[PDB]
Design a protein around this motif. Structure first.
Motif, PDB file in Angstrom:
ATOM      1  N   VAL A 157      69.046  29.464  26.878  1.00 59.71           N
ATOM      2  CA  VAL A 157      68.843  28.628  28.329  1.00 59.71           C
ATOM      3  C   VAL A 157      70.528  27.630  28.516  1.00 59.71           C
ATOM      4  CG1 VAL A 157      66.343  28.168  28.098  1.00 59.71           C
ATOM      5  CG2 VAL A 157      67.929  26.620  26.477  1.00 59.71           C
ATOM      6  N   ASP A 158      70.324  27.107  29.568  1.00 56.51           N
ATOM      7  CA  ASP A 158      72.056  26.402  29.591  1.00 56.51           C
ATOM      8  C   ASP A 158      72.951  27.561  29.904  1.00 56.51           C
ATOM      9  OD1 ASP A 158      70.601  24.359  31.015  1.00 56.51           O
ATOM     10  OD2 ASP A 158      69.680  23.475  29.130  1.00 56.51           O
ATOM     11  N   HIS A 161      72.350  33.291  35.513  1.00 59.02           N
ATOM     12  CA  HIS A 161      72.756  32.127  34.451  1.00 59.02           C
ATOM     13  C   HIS A 161      71.377  31.376  35.130  1.00 59.02           C
ATOM     14  CE1 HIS A 161      77.012  33.181  33.872  1.00 59.02           C
ATOM     15  NE2 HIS A 161      76.745  33.936  35.096  1.00 59.02           N
ATOM     16  N   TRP A 162      70.544  30.573  34.037  1.00 62.08           N
ATOM     17  CA  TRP A 162      69.451  29.601  33.954  1.00 62.08           C
ATOM     18  C   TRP A 162      69.544  28.739  33.369  1.00 62.08           C
ATOM     19  CZ3 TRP A 162      69.717  34.786  31.816  1.00 62.08           C
ATOM     20  CH2 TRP A 162      69.077  34.321  30.497  1.00 62.08           C
ATOM     21  N   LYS A 200      72.490  21.594  42.771  1.00 59.11           N
ATOM     22  CA  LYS A 200      72.179  22.393  41.003  1.00 59.11           C
ATOM     23  C   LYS A 200      71.013  23.457  41.920  1.00 59.11           C
ATOM     24  CE  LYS A 200      74.080  20.345  36.828  1.00 59.11           C
ATOM     25  NZ  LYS A 200      74.951  18.864  37.879  1.00 59.11           N
ATOM     26  N   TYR A 201      70.885  24.693  41.657  1.00 59.26           N
ATOM     27  CA  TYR A 201      69.600  25.368  41.460  1.00 59.26           C
ATOM     28  C   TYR A 201      69.281  25.458  40.123  1.00 59.26           C
ATOM     29  CZ  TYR A 201      70.532  25.283  46.505  1.00 59.26           C
ATOM     30  OH  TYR A 201      70.314  26.028  48.092  1.00 59.26           O
ATOM     31  N   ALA A 202      67.950  25.895  40.099  1.00 58.11           N
ATOM     32  CA  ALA A 202      67.593  26.274  38.998  1.00 58.11           C
ATOM     33  C   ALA A 202      68.137  28.023  38.124  1.00 58.11           C
ATOM     34  CB  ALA A 202      65.966  27.045  39.330  1.00 58.11           C
ATOM     35  N   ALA A 203      69.228  28.571  39.056  1.00 60.83           N
ATOM     36  CA  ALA A 203      69.494  29.987  38.561  1.00 60.83           C
ATOM     37  C   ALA A 203      69.867  30.192  39.983  1.00 60.83           C
ATOM     38  CB  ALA A 203      68.202  30.517  38.088  1.00 60.83           C
ATOM     39  N   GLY A 234      70.919  24.941  36.219  1.00 61.47           N
ATOM     40  CA  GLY A 234      71.023  26.581  35.593  1.00 61.47           C
ATOM     41  C   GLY A 234      71.993  27.165  36.586  1.00 61.47           C
ATOM     42  N   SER A 235      72.489  27.213  37.977  1.00 60.94           N
ATOM     43  CA  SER A 235      72.925  27.466  39.033  1.00 60.94           C
ATOM     44  C   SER A 235      74.628  27.593  38.417  1.00 60.94           C
ATOM     45  CB  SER A 235      73.082  27.246  40.423  1.00 60.94           C
ATOM     46  OG  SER A 235      72.912  25.928  40.363  1.00 60.94           O
TER      47      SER A 235
END
Ligand SMILES: C[C@H]1OC(C)(C)O[C@H]1[C@H](O)CNCCCn1cc(CNc2ccc(S(N)(=O)=O)cc2)nn1
Ligand SMILES: C[C@H]1OC(C)(C)O[C@H]1[C@H](O)CNCCCn1cc(CNc2ccc(S(N)(=O)=O)cc2)nn1
Ligand SMILES: [Zn+2]
Length: 257
Positions: free
Chosen positions: A238-239, A93-94, A110-113, A101-102
Motif C-alpha cells: 500500500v502507499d 500505484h495506490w 489525490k485519487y485512490a490510485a 494513492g495517485s
C-alpha cells in the motif's frame, strides 16, 4: 534497497539516485487553471486491438501486466508524440485509504490510485535504450476513483491472490487493456521522469482528465498484496506512490478547452 517505507521511501531516494532532485521529475501537481490549451496537439491514437498480454509479475513495488512488445501490436501515437510507442507493461500505484494513492494530483486532489500504461519509442529499438533518451517513453496515466466497479479490471483483481509476494508471476494471456480506459481521451501532457528509481528523465507524460471508477472491493484486493517475498515478514503493498515533485521550468499543456 529503495521502497516506500519510513527508512527507504521517496525522501531517501536521492542518496542513491541523485536525479531525484533533477529538473524534470515526476509526478507533479496539475494546476488546471495554469495548464494551457494547446491547439497544435493532435488527437491521441491508442491502438490496442492486437495487444498480446503475457504475464503478471509482483516486482516488490507494484504488479506489472507485461505485453509482447517484439512487434507493433499495441501502440500509442499522436497527441504530443512524434513516432510510434509500443506498449510494454501497465501497473498501478495506490493508497492505504481511498483519499490517497495517485502520483499525479489535480489541483492538489489525490485519487485512490493511478494506472500507468508504459510505452517505448520504437526509433530506439529496445526499452533499455529508450530510457536513456529524453523522448524515449510515453506513459499514459489514468486516475482511479472508488465508486462503481470497473468490469475490465476484474480479471486483474482475480489473479492477485496467485502473485501475493515479491517475485511471483502468473500467466496472463488475452487481457484487453482497452477495458481500463475512460470514455474521453482528453489529457494533460508535460515532460517528466520515471516515478521510481532510477527516476530517468525519459518520459512524455500523458495524463487523462477523466478518471475511471473502480469498486471498494477491487481496490481492497490491491491492498492485500505484499511488498515482501514469501516466508518474509508480511508488509502490505500500500502507499506505493511518489508525491508531487517541483514543476521547475515546465509547462503543462491541455488537449482540451
Ligand atoms: C529492514 C526492515 O526494517 C525496516 C523498518 C527498515 O524496514 C524493513 C524493510 O522493509 C526491510 N529491511 C531493509 C530493507 C529495505 N530497507 C533498506 C533500508 C536502509 N537502506 C537504504 C538503502 C538505499 C536507500 S535508497 N535507494 O537511497 O532509497 C534507502 C535506504 N531501509 N529499508
Ligand atoms: C537493466 C537493469 O538491469 C540491472 C538491474 C542489472 O541494471 C539495470 C540497468 O541499470 C538499466 N536496465 C533497466 C532498465 C532501466 N529501468 C527501468 C526500470 C523501471 N521502469 C519503470 C517504468 C515505468 C515507471 S512509471 N511509474 O510509469 O514512471 C517507472 C519505472 N528500472 N530500470
Ligand atoms: Zn508508475
Amino acid at each position: 534497497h529503495w521502497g516506500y517505507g519510513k527508512h527507504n521511501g521517496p525522501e531517501h531516494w536521492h542518496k542513491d539516485f541523485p536525479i531525484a532532485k533533477g529538473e524534470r521529475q515526476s509526478p507533479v501537481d496539475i494546476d488546471t487553471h495554469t495548464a494551457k490549451y494547446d491547439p497544435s496537439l493532435k488527437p491521441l491514437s491508442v491502438s490496442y486491438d492486437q495487444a498480446t498480454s503475457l504475464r503478471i509479475l509482483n516486482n516488490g513495488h507494484a504488479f506489472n501486466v507485461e505485453f509482447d512488445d517484439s512487434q507493433d501490436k499495441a501502440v500509442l501515437k499522436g497527441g504530443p508524440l512524434d513516432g510510434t510507442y509500443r506498449l510494454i507493461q501497465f501497473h498501478f500505484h495506490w493508497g492505504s485509504l481511498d483519499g490517497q494513492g495517485s502520483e499525479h494530483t489535480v489541483d492538489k486532489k489525490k485519487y485512490a490510485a493511478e494506472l500507468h500504461l508504459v510505452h517505448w519509442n520504437t526509433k530506439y529499438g529496445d526499452f533499455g535504450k529508450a530510457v536513456q533518451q529524453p523522448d524515449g517513453l510515453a506513459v499514459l496515466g489514468i486516475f482511479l476513483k472508488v465508486g462503481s466497479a470497473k468490469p475490465g479490471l476484474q480479471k486483474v483483481v482475480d489473479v492477485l491472490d496467485s502473485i501475493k509476494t515479491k517475485g511471483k508471476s502468473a500467466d496472463f494471456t488475452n487481457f484487453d487493456p482497452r477495458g481500463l480506459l475512460p470514455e474521453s481521451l482528453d489529457y494533460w501532457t508535460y515532460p517528466g521522469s520515471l516515478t521510481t528509481p532510477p527516476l530517468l528523465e525519459c518520459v512524455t507524460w500523458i495524463v487523462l482528465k477523466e478518471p475511471i471508477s473502480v469498486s471498494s472491493e477491487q481496490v481492497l484486493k490491491f491492498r492485500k498484496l505484499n511488498f515482501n517475498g514469501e516466508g518474509e515478514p508480511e508488509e502490505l503493498m500500500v502507499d506505493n506512490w511518489r508525491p508531487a515533485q517541483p514543476l521547475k521550468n515546465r509547462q503543462i499543456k491541455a488537449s482540451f478547452k
